[PDB]
Amino acid sequence: IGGAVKLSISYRNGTLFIMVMHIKDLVTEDGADPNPYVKTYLLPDNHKTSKRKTKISRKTRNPTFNEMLVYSGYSKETLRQRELQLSVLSAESLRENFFLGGVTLPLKDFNLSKETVKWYQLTAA
């Protein structure tokens, strides 16, 4: 577990925008290059509908995604009662997908009237 993810987070027209830009310095226990993708949830997830994820970036510890994850139909009031749970996992075809690191971000901490671009350190459980 290690590394850091750069995100751009904003809100416009009743929609939350999470831009996954890139990740640096992912590590694996056995030293082989992972196949990272990013998955996010908005928690708590009453209806169990909030999974979003990026494409897989293959064979790299420093993936660039520049992908936008979109959450529609939420008011800021509701969002301030949610946390964004971000996971980085390796896509594996011959073994279980495994956890490379994550970060949980209470959305109340953001100024959702502007765009916030920032680096976040990835951690364990």
Curated annotation (Swiss-Prot):
Belongs to the PI3/PI4-kinase family. It comes from Homo sapiens. Coiled coil: none annotated. It is linked to Oculoskeletodental syndrome: An autosomal recessive syndrome characterized by congenital cataracts, short stature, dysmorphic features with coarse facies, dental anomalies, multiple skeletal abnormalities, and neurological manifestations. Other recurrent features include hearing loss, secondary glaucoma, and nephrocalcinosis. Phosphorylated upon insulin stimulation; which may lead to enzyme activation. The chain holds residues 1559 to 1683 of 1686 of the full protein. Part of a complex with ERBB2 and EGFR. Interacts with clathrin trimers. Interacts with SBF2/MTMR13. Residues 1-120 form the C2 domain. A motif (Nuclear localization signal) lies at residues 50-61. It comes from the Eukaryota. Expressed in columnar and transitional epithelia, mononuclear cells, smooth muscle cells, and endothelial cells lining capillaries and small venules (at protein level). Ubiquitously expressed, with highest levels in heart, placenta and ovary, and lowest levels in the kidney. Detected at low levels in islets of Langerhans from type 2 diabetes mellitus individuals. It is found in: Cell membrane; Cytoplasmic vesicle, Clathrin-coated vesicle; Nucleus; Cytoplasm. Generates phosphatidylinositol 3-phosphate (PtdIns3P) and phosphatidylinositol 3,4-bisphosphate (PtdIns(3,4)P2) that act as second messengers. Has a role in several intracellular trafficking events. Functions in insulin signaling and secretion. Required for translocation of the glucose transporter SLC2A4/GLUT4 to the plasma membrane and glucose uptake in response to insulin-mediated RHOQ activation. This is Phosphatidylinositol 4-phosphate 3-kinase C2 domain-containing subunit alpha.
